[PDB]
Design an enzyme around this catalytic site. Structure first.
Site, PDB file in Angstrom:
ATOM      1  N   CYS A 190      35.216  45.537  56.708  1.00 38.74           N
ATOM      2  CA  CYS A 190      35.851  44.572  56.374  1.00 38.74           C
ATOM      3  C   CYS A 190      35.562  44.423  57.916  1.00 38.74           C
ATOM      4  O   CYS A 190      36.024  44.864  58.925  1.00 38.74           O
ATOM      5  CB  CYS A 190      36.969  44.502  56.085  1.00 38.74           C
ATOM      6  SG  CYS A 190      37.528  41.903  56.676  1.00 38.74           S
TER       7      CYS A 190
ATOM      8  N   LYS B  41      37.599  38.418  44.309  1.00 34.65           N
ATOM      9  CA  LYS B  41      36.860  38.232  45.790  1.00 34.65           C
ATOM     10  C   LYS B  41      37.988  38.038  46.792  1.00 34.65           C
ATOM     11  O   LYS B  41      39.312  38.359  46.389  1.00 34.65           O
ATOM     12  CB  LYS B  41      37.097  36.353  45.470  1.00 34.65           C
ATOM     13  CG  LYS B  41      35.899  36.118  46.525  1.00 34.65           C
ATOM     14  CD  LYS B  41      34.888  36.959  47.158  1.00 34.65           C
ATOM     15  CE  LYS B  41      34.119  37.176  48.539  1.00 34.65           C
ATOM     16  NZ  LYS B  41      33.125  37.869  49.447  1.00 34.65           N
TER      17      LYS B  41
ATOM     18  N   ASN C 237      40.483  46.178  51.084  1.00 34.08           N
ATOM     19  CA  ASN C 237      38.909  45.976  51.537  1.00 34.08           C
ATOM     20  C   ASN C 237      38.895  46.761  52.900  1.00 34.08           C
ATOM     21  O   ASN C 237      38.910  45.557  54.050  1.00 34.08           O
ATOM     22  CB  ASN C 237      38.242  44.778  51.017  1.00 34.08           C
ATOM     23  CG  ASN C 237      36.772  44.729  52.053  1.00 34.08           C
ATOM     24  OD1 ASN C 237      36.481  45.412  52.020  1.00 34.08           O
ATOM     25  ND2 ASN C 237      36.566  43.316  51.765  1.00 34.08           N
TER      26      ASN C 237
HETATM   27  C1  FMN Z   1      27.538  38.326  47.092  1.00 33.19           C
HETATM   28  C2  FMN Z   1      28.700  39.203  47.440  1.00 33.19           C
HETATM   29  C3  FMN Z   1      29.193  39.169  47.322  1.00 33.19           C
HETATM   30  C4  FMN Z   1      30.458  40.214  47.986  1.00 33.19           C
HETATM   31  N1  FMN Z   1      31.694  40.008  48.746  1.00 33.19           N
HETATM   32  C5  FMN Z   1      32.613  41.178  48.427  1.00 33.19           C
HETATM   33  C6  FMN Z   1      33.987  40.696  48.723  1.00 33.19           C
HETATM   34  O1  FMN Z   1      34.468  39.669  48.669  1.00 33.19           O
HETATM   35  N2  FMN Z   1      34.115  42.311  49.154  1.00 33.19           N
HETATM   36  C7  FMN Z   1      33.996  43.816  48.714  1.00 33.19           C
HETATM   37  O2  FMN Z   1      35.029  44.457  48.859  1.00 33.19           O
HETATM   38  N3  FMN Z   1      32.668  43.901  48.369  1.00 33.19           N
HETATM   39  C8  FMN Z   1      32.225  42.699  48.335  1.00 33.19           C
HETATM   40  N4  FMN Z   1      30.802  42.772  48.090  1.00 33.19           N
HETATM   41  C9  FMN Z   1      30.112  44.430  47.885  1.00 33.19           C
HETATM   42  C10 FMN Z   1      29.777  44.676  46.100  1.00 33.19           C
HETATM   43  O3  FMN Z   1      31.859  44.595  46.178  1.00 33.19           O
HETATM   44  C11 FMN Z   1      29.425  45.934  46.330  1.00 33.19           C
HETATM   45  O4  FMN Z   1      29.836  46.419  47.153  1.00 33.19           O
HETATM   46  C12 FMN Z   1      28.246  46.172  46.917  1.00 33.19           C
HETATM   47  O5  FMN Z   1      26.879  44.727  46.439  1.00 33.19           O
HETATM   48  C13 FMN Z   1      27.484  46.931  46.119  1.00 33.19           C
HETATM   49  O6  FMN Z   1      27.381  47.390  45.060  1.00 33.19           O
HETATM   50  P1  FMN Z   1      26.341  46.861  44.178  1.00 33.19           P
HETATM   51  O7  FMN Z   1      24.676  48.123  44.222  1.00 33.19           O
HETATM   52  O8  FMN Z   1      26.906  46.734  42.649  1.00 33.19           O
HETATM   53  O9  FMN Z   1      25.332  45.402  44.275  1.00 33.19           O
HETATM   54  C14 FMN Z   1      29.811  41.496  47.763  1.00 33.19           C
HETATM   55  C15 FMN Z   1      28.340  41.894  47.337  1.00 33.19           C
HETATM   56  C16 FMN Z   1      27.409  40.483  47.448  1.00 33.19           C
HETATM   57  C17 FMN Z   1      26.511  40.986  46.380  1.00 33.19           C
HETATM   58  N1  XRO Z   2      27.885  37.713  56.292  1.00 31.17           N
HETATM   59  C1  XRO Z   2      28.596  38.048  57.231  1.00 31.17           C
HETATM   60  C2  XRO Z   2      29.637  39.063  57.799  1.00 31.17           C
HETATM   61  C3  XRO Z   2      31.372  39.781  56.841  1.00 31.17           C
HETATM   62  C4  XRO Z   2      30.616  41.134  56.595  1.00 31.17           C
HETATM   63  C5  XRO Z   2      32.059  41.447  55.052  1.00 31.17           C
HETATM   64  C6  XRO Z   2      32.994  40.835  55.245  1.00 31.17           C
HETATM   65  C7  XRO Z   2      33.934  41.047  53.862  1.00 31.17           C
HETATM   66  C8  XRO Z   2      33.783  40.704  52.815  1.00 31.17           C
HETATM   67  C9  XRO Z   2      32.348  41.003  51.740  1.00 31.17           C
HETATM   68  C10 XRO Z   2      31.149  40.445  52.288  1.00 31.17           C
HETATM   69  C11 XRO Z   2      30.800  39.252  52.925  1.00 31.17           C
HETATM   70  O1  XRO Z   2      32.013  38.023  52.380  1.00 31.17           O
HETATM   71  O2  XRO Z   2      29.930  38.656  53.406  1.00 31.17           O
HETATM   72  N2  XRO Z   2      29.611  41.065  51.408  1.00 31.17           N
HETATM   73  C12 XRO Z   2      29.701  42.416  50.838  1.00 31.17           C
HETATM   74  O3  XRO Z   2      28.868  42.457  50.625  1.00 31.17           O
HETATM   75  N3  XRO Z   2      31.312  43.161  51.673  1.00 31.17           N
HETATM   76  C13 XRO Z   2      32.332  42.635  51.659  1.00 31.17           C
HETATM   77  O4  XRO Z   2      33.391  43.770  51.333  1.00 31.17           O
HETATM   78  C14 XRO Z   2      33.372  39.683  55.799  1.00 31.17           C
HETATM   79  C15 XRO Z   2      31.890  39.275  56.839  1.00 31.17           C
END
Ligand code: FMN
Ligand code: XRO
Ligand code: FMN
Ligand code: XRO
Lengths: 313, 313
Positions: B131, B44, B128
């Protein structure tokens, strides 16, 4: 009971219309949209001169939506102006003309000509900020200073209430900046959210090939792929632009989808992909479906729920 | 016939991994990812300090995908660094650690301390860039000057090969500019396309309500909604960054979806939404499905088709 509404000093039988570019290129197309049950129609975005557009295949549709790189094929501004001035039957429904010049000067030249026709006949202007890629600079609505120039110059040249067709934004800072630009212009009386989600890529697994010929297969996305994006833009601008109308476009296949657009803030609801796929029969179904959901909920008017999406806490 | 890959000086049984944020926040989650059939895992995205994140509900899923405004809930950097240093079993599969500091200084602080563990244990950094930075400014990777600064500072502080997680772009100008920024940094050896499609809005028709609590219901979209956007970004960076790897993420539910990613240029293939919904058993299914497509087509290895999407004429 009935879905009729009044906006922009015009009466509409219902909030439905085509999305610019769909079923609106030729005289035949415009006559078909006029014959339909839609509340309004809009013409294909035009340039000063006619364009052939891009090579085919340039549009494809799939269960989840469509991809296009049409290339602004159109019959030219003189044709659309003549349709607005001499051919359109305004007793049937209102007409919007979409303009998409490739420079500010071209837009100014067209709007100056449109303005007397707008005053005499009541045709409405939708100014399209999307355009073909120019290497080294962004699309106009993604270049805030260019957007401001376009709107300033068109506002001066046209002098009457108009609307703007916007691409989607994906960042809350962008929503704030875009809305503050639009709000500098009191003549911008409606905002249409959204144009296609830019530069997607559909690949066919069997052939291992892209599905459209221009742009190495890249093109704008419509349909089911883009409904939450569309709702987000509708609502973001509805919240930010209290003195303007918002027209919703993107992902409408059903009365329920239209209901969601209206809850987000939409005054008119435009139908692109689904109309291209289903044909103009779709408008009777959308009307029936939206009235059914209103009846089940106890709503008698659109105003009762427009913009009334609920938030949590 | 095989799914093996050798990249970044590691060996991978197959291209599949979780997407950062899914099934990777706790020690339990990382152990589960390690026990699965995936080829790798990523942790994460972390901050210096632990975070609770946003109020619930903050994630919801539907037949076409998901929406989230999680708010970076995580156990803090020290936890993920200890997992990488002391707990992960590198004999099972490679580990990526995702970092998402809230300022350039926070990222620099973390990568300085990750470096010696990267060097000794082989954990791989995913930075990332999709962000937040300053509230009222766009996300880092939508602010090209900020992106350059983050990459300059992290490259100097870390001093080892790393990769970056990118939001989707929608404008050719942005593909061009973003890839040119990335190409300034030789230590950026992989580019993961894409993060969520930002600030969508899902509305439930029955309740007339948004479905997540933070941000008035706005959040990032994943899943079926985003596959053509994801493929476009993989291909765009694959074409523009010939000296880098591209990892695909977005809209992977099947071996067919994975095969399209790989045709577009993907090395590794990450799975978010569909893994959140189906659980870690998805990896066996994806592997089987991909192998079946390869067997039908006569492909024996991934390299036979990676980046080999055909264009028309
Ligand atoms: C619940 C959740 C949490 C996520 N948290 C992050 C994160 O911490 N860092 C990040 O790079 N992307 C995060 N993402 C984005 C996913 O890594 C991914 O880029 C995005 O969901 C698209 O892929 P998918 O179509 O397979 O869901 C998150 C997505 C979801 C659904
Ligand atoms: N909620 C909210 C706004 C927000 C959006 C992105 C991020 C970075 C972490 C992350 C998140 C998240 O922790 O919300 N979700 C994503 O789908 N991708 C991400 O890269 C942190 C905060
Ligand atoms: C074949 C086609 C041509 C289009 N041409 C234009 C156009 O000329 N002007 C414009 O503003 N939008 C144009 N669009 C975008 C649509 O008006 C609409 O914004 C988009 O397709 C999203 O709506 P949908 O999900 O209902 O398709 C076009 C769309 C398609 C599919
Ligand atoms: N092909 C291609 C690139 C391109 C993109 C946009 C425009 C403006 C007209 C337009 C078109 C089009 O004619 O391609 N398609 C849309 O989905 N939206 C539009 O606004 C013209 C050309």
């Amino acid at each position: 009971m009935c879905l009729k509404l009044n906006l922009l000093d015009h009466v509409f039988a219902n909030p439905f219309m085509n999305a610019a570019g769909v079923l609106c290129s030729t005289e035949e197309d415009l006559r078909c949209m006029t014959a339909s049950s839609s509340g309004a129609l809009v013409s294909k975005s035009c340039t000063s001169a006619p364009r052939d557009g891009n090579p085919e295949p340039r549009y494809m549709a799939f269960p989840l939506g469509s991809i296009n790189s049409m290339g602004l094929p159109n019959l030219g501004f003189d044709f659309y102006l003549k349709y607005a001035s001499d051919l359109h039957d305004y007793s049937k429904k209102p007409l919007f003309l979409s303009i998409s010049g490739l420079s500010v000067e071209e837009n100014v030249a067209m709007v100056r000509r449109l303005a007397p026709v707008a005053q005499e006949k009541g045709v409405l202007l939708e100014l399209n900020l999307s355009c073909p890629n120019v290497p080294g600079k962004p699309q106009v609505a993604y270049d805030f200073e260019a957007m401001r120039t376009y709107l300033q110059q068109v506002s001066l040249a046209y002098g009457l209430p108009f609307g703007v067709k916007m691409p989607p934004y994906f960042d809350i800072a962008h929503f704030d900046t875009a809305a503050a630009v639009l709000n500098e212009f009191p003549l911008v009386k409606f905002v249409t959210c959204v144009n296609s989600v830019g530069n997607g890529l559909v690949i066919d697994a069997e052939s291992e090939s892209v599905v459209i010929k221009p742009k190495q297969g890249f093109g704008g996305l419509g349909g089911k792929y883009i409904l939450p994006t569309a709702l987000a833009n509708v609502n973001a601008f509805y919240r930010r632009c209290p003195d303007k109308l918002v027209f919703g476009c993107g992902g409408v296949y059903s009365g329920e989808d239209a209901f969601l657009h209206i809850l987000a803030g939409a005054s008119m609801v435009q139908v692109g992909t689904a109309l291209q796929e289903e044909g103009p029969g779709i408008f009777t179904r959308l009307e029936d479906e939206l009235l059914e959901i209103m009846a089940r909920k106890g709503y008698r008017t659109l105003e009762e729920f427009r913009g009334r999406v609920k938030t949590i806490e």
